[PDB]
Design a protein around this ligand. Sequence first.
Ligand SMILES: Nc1ncnc2c1ncn2[C@@H]1O[C@H](COP(=O)(O)OP(=O)(O)OP(=O)(O)O)[C@@H](O)[C@H]1O
Ligand SMILES: C/C1=C/C(=O)O[C@@H]2C[C@@H](CC[C@H](C)/C=C\C=C\CC1)O[C@@](O)([C@@H]1CSC(=O)N1)C2
Ligand SMILES: [Ca+2]
Ligand SMILES: [Ca+2]
Ligand SMILES: [Ca+2]
Lengths: 125, 359
Amino acid sequence: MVVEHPEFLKAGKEPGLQIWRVEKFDLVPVPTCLYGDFFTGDAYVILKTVQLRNGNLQYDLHYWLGNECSQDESGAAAIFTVQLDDYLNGRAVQHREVQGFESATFLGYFKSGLKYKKGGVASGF
Amino acid sequence: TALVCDNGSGLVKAGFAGDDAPRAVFPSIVGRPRDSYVGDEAQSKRGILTLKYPIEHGIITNWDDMEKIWHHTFYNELRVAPEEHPTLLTEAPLNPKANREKMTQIMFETFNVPAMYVAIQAVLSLYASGRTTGIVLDSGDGVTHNVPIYEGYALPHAIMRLDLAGRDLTDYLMKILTERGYSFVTTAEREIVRDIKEKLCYVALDFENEMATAASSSSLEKSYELPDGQVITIGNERFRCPETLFQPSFIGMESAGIHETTYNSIMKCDIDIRKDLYANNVMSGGTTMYPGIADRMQKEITALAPSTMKIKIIAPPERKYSVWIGGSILASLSTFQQMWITKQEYDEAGPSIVHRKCF
Ligand SMILES: Nc1ncnc2c1ncn2[C@@H]1O[C@H](COP(=O)(O)OP(=O)(O)OP(=O)(O)O)[C@@H](O)[C@H]1O
Ligand SMILES: C/C1=C/C(=O)O[C@@H]2C[C@@H](CC[C@H](C)/C=C\C=C\CC1)O[C@@](O)([C@@H]1CSC(=O)N1)C2
Ligand SMILES: [Ca+2]
Ligand SMILES: [Ca+2]
Ligand SMILES: [Ca+2]
């Protein structure tokens, strides 16, 4: 192991919410303005980093799968989630989030209410 | 371009990383004179040359011939110079340490691959189903495994192996059929019955009521066309052959049933993760293709589990190729560049590097 992926270097360094979209077998950062709006045809990876009182950080990793994402995308998102967890010393809690069946915890991350939109990127296969 | 190679007891599934399916699927057989022929052709010249399966119950058992399988794979099936493509291979759960080192040495020494990696078949199937956690039922030609997986890695202590699978089932159709009055007893004959297996067999949700309808209704019957031409009417084996999976006594095996090993596998796992397992039972391998098998496992494990348990059997249509497809996605990830075992790394540490780079 020992990923060198630029996005990995940025992942989990300060409290907050980081959202990536799987695009052609790659982890691509989502513009922060667009957080909470998910394409039903895509798969995303979400990292919630929370300040612990002890000074270290708490991580929850969610891989979110839209109703129409392709198998390469859901597969990639699941794998990306294992790697990011590993990268973060195993400290992350991993969560599978399916469109329409997301955990209350994940839903709570979006102030303005989470939103679904039709479409997304093409399968990298 | 990385290559993906899933070597099975019966079939080789080979191709390019990035593709949505294996470009090459062929019999895992080597024929040597009665210096050898590989897969689709060896059954052909099977009159001159003895044929053998280098892989038994998912484990490599004839290195010499296995080396032939790979050569044919790169050269006759894939049409590549192996020395220019990182190559991903698959292995059974619990492959002995020495096998894994021998497979790595051969790849870097006799094939000169620039990079290499080995992943556990079932874990790849879990990944292909978009999941990091669950228990895989993998059942091919030569073996069946129950493999519980948690946040990305298999739980080796809880894995179940069962040497009953695909071929074992062919031989029993192909023995129960003759009871009706047919032939079937040649190394070309089961070949026909395995085709009948694949076309006519199905798993019944209730055996008894299926019985109480079979020996009492010319409706649970189908007609099949042998190559000879003579038509035969498959009955009632349709539902009896795969029943061996659930009741292994039928082949006089005594072993626990696939539903039972599934329960047992889960009970060897930390209590806190059992829910996640029960709700993510993924089926993989040719021998899970039987119509009705997901509905049966369902019923069979909810009987076994606490009423409160949310059971869910996941049976993707492409599950004949799930392992391969899982590898195709893994080796295509932008993040996989550094997971590979390089020839450099091999030169530094030799074949034991596999146990450190390849959990
Ligand atoms: N539709 C079908 N119904 C039932 N059996 C099927 C079907 N299609 C293929 N099979 C059987 O599945 C087997 C091929 O499965 P698979 O390729 O997963 O096994 P393998 O990888 O070669 O073996 P193993 O995993 O045990 O080493 C053969 O026994 C074949 O008859
Ligand atoms: C389409 C196909 C699928 C398959 O699964 O093949 C594998 C490989 C195959 C190789 C031996 C035979 C004679 C020669 C060529 C076969 C070609 C195609 C076979 O031996 C099996 O048939 C055995 C025997 S009976 C069974 O249950 N497994 C499984
Ligand atoms: Ca998409
Ligand atoms: Ca973790
Ligand atoms: Ca297999």
